[PDB]
Structure formats: C-alpha cells, structure tokens
Design a protein around this ligand. Sequence first.
Ligand SMILES: CCOc1ccc(CC(=O)O)cc1
Lengths: 171, 172
Amino acid sequence: PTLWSRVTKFGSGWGFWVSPTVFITTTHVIPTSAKEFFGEPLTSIAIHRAGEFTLFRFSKKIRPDLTGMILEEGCPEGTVCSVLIKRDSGELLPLAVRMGAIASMRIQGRLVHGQSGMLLTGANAKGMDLGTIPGDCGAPYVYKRANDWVVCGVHAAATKSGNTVVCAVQA
Amino acid sequence: APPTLWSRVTKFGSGWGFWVSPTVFITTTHVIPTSAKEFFGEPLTSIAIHRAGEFTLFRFSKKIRPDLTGMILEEGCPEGTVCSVLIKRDSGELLPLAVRMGAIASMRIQGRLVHGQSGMLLTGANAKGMDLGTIPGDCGAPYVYKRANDWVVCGVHAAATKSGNTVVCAVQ
Ligand SMILES: CCOc1ccc(CC(=O)O)cc1
C-alpha cells in the first residue's frame, strides 16, 4: 500500500489519485483532444479548473484499492514538502522543497501563479536526480502531519536555474 | 543514475551488494549469510575477503561480471557531497534517495554500535517510512555521486535512525 501507486502517467506529464474517484493534475499537461480518460467517457467526468490546477471527479470508482486522502489549498509557509517525481527510466525521485508565499513569476518564458518553493538539493543537479525536468509537471506536493499524508498541489513550473518551483493549488 | 550503475546492484543475503569491477563485490557485513561457503559458483578458499567493521570487500580469482568496467571506489566523500543511495524496491522500482554527507561518526542506532560516514536525507522533512526513507532490507545498497565527467562509489548502506533523517554509509 503506497503513496507512489497514486502517481500516474497522464498526457505530457503526471497526475495523482486523491481517492477512488478524484484525480488531480497540472492544466497544461492534459490532452486537448479526448473522448475518454481511464476508460470513462468525458460525458461522465466533472472538470474543475483554477489556472494551472485541474481536478477530475469520476462517476464511478477507477481506483477502488485506494482510501481518500486530505487535499488542502497549499501549506503553511516554511513547510518542507516532498515532490513525488516519477521518471520513464523507472526511477522514483522524492525531492525536499521548502515552501514559501503564493506568488506570480515569469519562470523562464511565461507568467505562473501558485505556491513558490525552493529545492533543498542545493549546489546543482548536473545529474537529473537532484532537480526537476519539464516532463515532471503534474507530480504531487505532499507532507506528513500528525498520522496523515496531506497533498497540497501539483508541479506547474521550475526556473532555468532549477532553484525555484511553483506548486499549483486548488481555489 | 545511469543504467550501468543499477546493473551492478545485486540481491545478496538479507539486503544488497555492488560490483565495483568484474572481480570486486562490496556489501554491508551484517547482510552476509554467515553459513555460506560458496559465492557465484566459487569456493570460499578462492576469494580474498577484506572486512573493516560494517564494510566487506570480496575479490574473486576469476571474472564473475565480465560485462562490467572497473570504476573508482573511494573511502567516503568530502563533507557536503550530495550522494544517491541506489535502492531497489518491490517491482522493478528504482529509488535513488538523495543524501547530504557529513562527518565520520560513532553512534548507537537501535541499540547497535555503528561507525561510518553520517548523512542526512534530502527527500522530505521527516523520512520515517518506506515512501521517503530507508528500510532494513536496503542495507548494502551503494552510495554514489557524479563528478564533472564520471561517477564514484564511496560506501554501502549500514544503518538509519528511528526518525529516518540520519543514515550511515560504511566505508573502506
Ligand atoms: C523547518 C525548515 O527550516 C529550514 C529549512 C531549510 C533551510 C535551508 C534552505 O532554505 O536552503 C533553512 C531553514
């Protein structure tokens, strides 16, 4: 029974099963041409979009093996989260991120709104296993609080230098 | 981490070991099956064994892994080096855990006395559990890092604190 089984390949990135019927992802990775997802017609899926955060609610249980998890709108400033990166290589890459303020920035090309954070692997990756890449968008941000895992958003962007990351949040 | 490093990580005893070269295999002393008299088809009498506390090196008299090139084994690494611990988990999942390395230390962990290079995980705030931290089955997994042009191996997983935050790499 694992958090990691909830992280699923989707579109140009990844998404995360909060419960048997709730899936969260980054808006820009979602296929723009589709009639169905996970074998359910789009007919029967509720979509809730807020900028770079998207939540799907399915009308039947897609992942009945899972319990429902706590989903919150970001986390307190100073919280050290983990970004749960999956790679097509087969690597699982949990990276520590110090979370900061809600903000807008022009991460490389474009403007992005969400909860800013700083990677805690420091120095420099030179070596993909200490930083994010474009293909990682949709990976979830999580932390342990009391006895429970909290999910507080999804990977939307990371600066050229790789240091600053943006976690898109609900509402 | 490159495929050629993952190919060197071998299930062994109650944990893992790592092929440095076609003739050299390293592991954590406590994962070795203590009754064993044969390794990779070779008798004990044909293997040179070098033991320093929780670090064990086996040198064979024939090439066991001729597919491999010999790489660099160092006695730990500079303070502040970020290593990956090359951990295999249930189902062809590969978990290269990031760790910031510190001083050579003597500690008491789960009642046992352990000596090696201390480090702190860079995976999350608390790491007590299998999702972000180590488990006892991980012992013997190698500590590797990348330089300008190559990769080095600098020790094997020996222990981790109850909190999960601190780990110990046994060194040559
Ligand atoms: C409880 C979290 O507190 C801190 C965590 C990380 C740093 C180091 C950094 O931000 O690079 C500083 C303070």
